[PDB]
């Protein structure tokens, strides 16, 4: 019927002045474009079929040709930036926004999907989709008392499209657009579907990545308890964006960081810092470094949740990227922590795994470790226990490692290493 057609056959059928012949050639195009291996996107573009598909989107008296062009165009917009640009250049943005008002759920849905692919390309197409007024009709589709009345697949597509309108950074989405989307997005973050939750979390992770004003916008909507609750999910596709969003929030103000702690996020970190997935471990340790960079009372809540032995362990054995975040977490801890807090760190066995990381061929981690050691020696100076820590560093072969760093390429490494040896050894 409409299977294994050539581009020239589709061109013949679409160039006819027969709607049904156009409908069959459009179905044949969609099928060609749906295929898994090397669909001929560029061939369909070069043939000049995109304006033809876009014009078929307006054919209200033929709902199947609306669906088929919509699907065809969606798959062209899912390709490269030049391929998404072609769909936009064909004038498909206003055409797809009008389609959101279709009385046919499958056409309405295809429009939502295509707008998601266009917005997902980057900031410029994201903002162009917003300028053409996509947000109002998309949010009107979710204006129901209970989200559970909408079809699963339909709700998943809307949430994913909305997350792409929250995505990309130079620039970030317009503040007005973010403010209009946020109430629906919070409502989706409480919906009982795992894919809806994951995509809702991604959207929140995108909105919290940037200035503190943007973190504040999100935090004021009271999403932090829900993000902590999702941070404990058994589904990795939910934990990954949840931890991202929590990670972002703690890059902001101490007050914003505190909201995360108050919601009980640190209770989840014993598992997070031992998670089998490297990215979760790395992101959890990074989230930890920005918490230890906080107030002394925040460092105290880390101690209280027994998280210092968990940092000792990641420092001892983890992926080098996670171990790099762990060094940062210790340097931040020792920078703003009390003498009692720093003494507790040495007692938990921080010196040995900290010294073993001085063998690394990364200058930045060496710099971070040497600053942490300096901060630990300052706490030892205040108690008159400098010799105790000096022998402690000599016993685990720490001193030798600093001895070799005196003859290093980096100046900041060369200075700090030579300074510790003349001041304490």
């Amino acid at each position: 019927g409409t299977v294994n057609w050539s581009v020239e056959d589709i061109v013949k059928g679409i160039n006819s002045n027969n709607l049904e012949s156009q409908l069959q050639a459009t179905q044949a195009a969609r099928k060609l474009l749906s295929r898994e291996k090397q669909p001929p996107i560029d061939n369909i573009i070069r043939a000049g079929l995109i304006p033809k598909f876009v014009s078929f989107l307006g054919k209200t008296d033929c709902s199947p040709i609306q669906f088929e062009s919509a699907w065809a165009l969606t798959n062209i917009a899912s390709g490269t930036s030049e391929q998404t640009k072609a769909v936009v250049d064909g004038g498909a943005i206003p055409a797809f926004i009008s389609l959101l008002a279709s009385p046919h759920a499958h056409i309405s849905e295809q429009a939502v999907w295509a707008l998601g692919n266009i917005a997902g390309d980057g900031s410029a197409f994201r903002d162009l989709v917003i300028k053409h007024g996509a947000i109002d009709p998309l949010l009107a589709l979710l204006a129901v008392p209970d989200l559970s009345t909408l079809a699963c697949g339909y709700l998943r597509n809307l949430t994913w499209t909305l997350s792409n309108l929250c995505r990309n950074k130079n620039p970030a989405p317009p503040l007005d657009a973010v403010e209009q989307i946020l109430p629906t997005l919070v409502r989706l973050l409480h919906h009982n579907d795992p894919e809806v939750l994951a995509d809702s979390c991604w959207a929140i992770s995108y909105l919290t990545d940037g200035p503190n004003e943007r973190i504040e916008m999100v935090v004021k909507k009271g999403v932090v308890p829900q993000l902590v609750k999702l941070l404990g999910a058994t589904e990795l596709p939910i934990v990954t964006p949840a931890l991202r969003a929590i990670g972002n929030i703690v890059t902001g103000t101490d007050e914003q960081t505190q909201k995360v702690i108050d919601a009980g996020a640190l209770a989840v970190f014993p598992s997070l810092l031992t998670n089998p997935k490297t990215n979760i471990q790395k992101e959890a340790t990074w989230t930890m470094s920005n918490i230890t960079a906080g107030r002394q009372d925040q460092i105290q809540q880390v101690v209280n949740h027994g998280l210092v032995p968990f940092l000792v362990g990641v420092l001892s054995k983890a992926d080098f990227k996670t171990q790099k975040e762990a060094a940062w977490a210790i340097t931040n801890y020792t920078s703003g922590g009390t003498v009692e807090q720093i003494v507790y760190l040495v007692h938990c066995g921080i010196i040995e795994p900290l010294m073993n990381l001085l063998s690394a061929k990364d200058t930045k981690i060496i710099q971070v470790i040497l600053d942490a050691i300096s901060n630990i020696f300052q706490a030892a100076e205040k108690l008159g226990e400098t010799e105790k820590l000096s022998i402690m560093i000599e016993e685990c072969g720490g001193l030798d490692k600093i001895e070799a760093l005196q003859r290093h390429e980096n100046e900041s490494v060369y200075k700090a290493s030579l300074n510790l040896i003349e001041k304490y050894f």
């Binding site: 969606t74 899912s78 390709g79 295809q110 997902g120």
Partner: peptide, 7 residues
Amino acid sequence: LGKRKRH
């Protein structure tokens, strides 16, 4: 994440 094609 990124773009999604149908079927």
